[PDB]
Amino acid sequence: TGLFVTLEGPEGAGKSTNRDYLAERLRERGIEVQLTREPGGTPLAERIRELLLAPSDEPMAADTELLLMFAARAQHLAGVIRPALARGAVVLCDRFTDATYAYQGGGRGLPEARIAALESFVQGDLRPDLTLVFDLPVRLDRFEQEDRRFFEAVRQTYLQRAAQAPERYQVLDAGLPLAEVQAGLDRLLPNLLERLN
Amino acid sequence: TGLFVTLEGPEGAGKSTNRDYLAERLRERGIEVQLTREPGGTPLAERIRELLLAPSDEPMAADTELLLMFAARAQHLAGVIRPALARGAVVLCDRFTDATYAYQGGGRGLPEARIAALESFVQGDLRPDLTLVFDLPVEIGARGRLDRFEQEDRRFFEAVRQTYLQRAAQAPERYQVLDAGLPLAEVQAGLDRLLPNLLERLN
Numbered sequence A: 001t002g003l004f005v006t007l008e009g010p011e012g013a014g015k016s017t018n019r020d021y022l023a024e025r026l027r028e029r030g031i032e033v034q035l036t037r038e039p040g041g042t043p044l045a046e047r048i049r050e051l052l053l054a055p056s057d058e059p060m061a062a063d064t065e066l067l068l069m070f071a072a073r074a075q076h077l078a079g080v081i082r083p084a085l086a087r088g089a090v091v092l093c094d095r096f097t098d099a100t101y102a103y104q105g106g107g108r109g110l111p112e113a114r115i116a117a118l119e120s121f122v123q124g125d126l127r128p129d130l131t132l133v134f135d136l137p138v139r140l141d142r143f144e145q146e147d148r149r150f151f152e153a154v155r156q157t158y159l160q161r162a163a164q165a166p167e168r169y170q171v172l173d174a175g176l177p178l179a180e181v182q183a184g185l186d187r188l189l190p191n192l193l194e195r196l197n
Numbered sequence B: 001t002g003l004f005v006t007l008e009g010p011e012g013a014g015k016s017t018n019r020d021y022l023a024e025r026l027r028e029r030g031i032e033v034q035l036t037r038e039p040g041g042t043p044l045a046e047r048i049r050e051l052l053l054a055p056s057d058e059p060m061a062a063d064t065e066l067l068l069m070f071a072a073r074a075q076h077l078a079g080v081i082r083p084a085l086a087r088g089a090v091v092l093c094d095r096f097t098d099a100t101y102a103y104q105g106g107g108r109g110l111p112e113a114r115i116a117a118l119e120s121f122v123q124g125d126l127r128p129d130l131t132l133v134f135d136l137p138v139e140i141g142a143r144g145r146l147d148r149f150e151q152e153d154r155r156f157f158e159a160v161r162q163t164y165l166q167r168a169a170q171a172p173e174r175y176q177v178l179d180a181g182l183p184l185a186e187v188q189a190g191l192d193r194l195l196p197n198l199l200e201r202l203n
């Protein structure tokens, strides 16, 4: 049995360096670590990501964007995430369904219930064991074209979701000195290892 | 007030030769016709189509394939189908959700209940007003499809064929089954025969 950990938050929050940090802590304890990201994580998922990010003169329907995001997820689950967990590996996934509630839900305004329906439809009972929210104040692809209010509603959705399920989430103040943040990651580790074992 | 007509069946069933005939019967009667096809029908929906058709060493999960089909459908609905019906055009759409039940359901073995939930999720209350099923026994009659579906065996395609006939029989009011194996004159007669009912559905 393995463990499914997701990381959510914007760039410049240190997600990658901190994911590397966590990954080294686990690896030095003999635990296999599978790094991955969404949307993407397999050849086909990465091609779907390309459609998602590529600007176009044709407006992408909201449902189209939502269904593509979940198509990439479906493929990623089958190709990478589930097999990793089956190996007893710890998956460190940069962005997952919380990013859907945040971007397609908070950002775009899609009803949370439609996102919930697809989450269950695609994932069955699988949810992350732990979700690390890297929180900090707020050419381009389709999403980077968006405005400050979009990214503000994005930020707030992570915190709202994190607040409703405090046991599954750990919110990190990415505005804190890196050293302090990684100290937080160290304090999370025992519980992580306990979960895994 | 338009009419949403879909055409189902494999390649070499005459769907296109038949669609052109049907489209002209409508046009000569002063009726606007919108030709389209799935997966695809808009630039983004065609990009999705090409992903679905592209061979790869990585197997596409059945759910991935189902979701991409519906993603293309949602874009196509918004950009072509709903507008056309709104203008009061007759949409003649090559392939639609019946192909999903047939390919993803019958072929891939996905449960009909899962397909139905997506159908509703994406389409709301919109379903075809009339579906023409061009029924053809599995007939290989040069390089093949040249796409992902080329690799599937006869059993897969038998299941596809049978799914169409089962759906048509379950709701005879909405489907017309044509024998696409007939000489083209006789298929045209089939089109001629169903035309008056199609017209009555429009007004």
Ligand SMILES: Cc1cn([C@H]2C[C@H](N=[N+]=[N-])[C@@H](COP(=O)(O)O)O2)c(=O)[nH]c1=O
Pocket: A037, A038, A039, A069, A095, A096, A097, A098, A099, A100, A101, A103, A104, A143, A144
């Ligand atoms: C996984 C996921 C990502 N996204 C967005 C977040 C990102 N847009 N920004 N900023 C983009 C991912 O690109 P990056 O991983 O390079 O950040 O896709 C969603 O909108 N929904 C999702 O479910």
Ligand SMILES: Cc1cn([C@H]2C[C@H](N=[N+]=[N-])[C@@H](COP(=O)(O)O)O2)c(=O)[nH]c1=O
Pocket: B010, B011, B038, B039, B069, B095, B096, B097, B099, B100, B101, B103, B104, B149
């Ligand atoms: C519309 C639709 C098509 N398809 C398949 C049927 C076809 N493969 N074969 N034979 C392919 C459509 O391409 P053609 O119409 O050019 O044949 O996509 C689906 O699997 N699901 C769908 O929902």
Ligand SMILES: [Cl-]
Pocket: A008, A009, A010, A011, A154
């Ligand atoms: Cl973010």
Ligand SMILES: [Cl-]
Pocket: A035, A036, A037, A094
């Ligand atoms: Cl990654």
Ligand SMILES: [Cl-]
Pocket: B035, B036, B037, B094
């Ligand atoms: Cl067409």
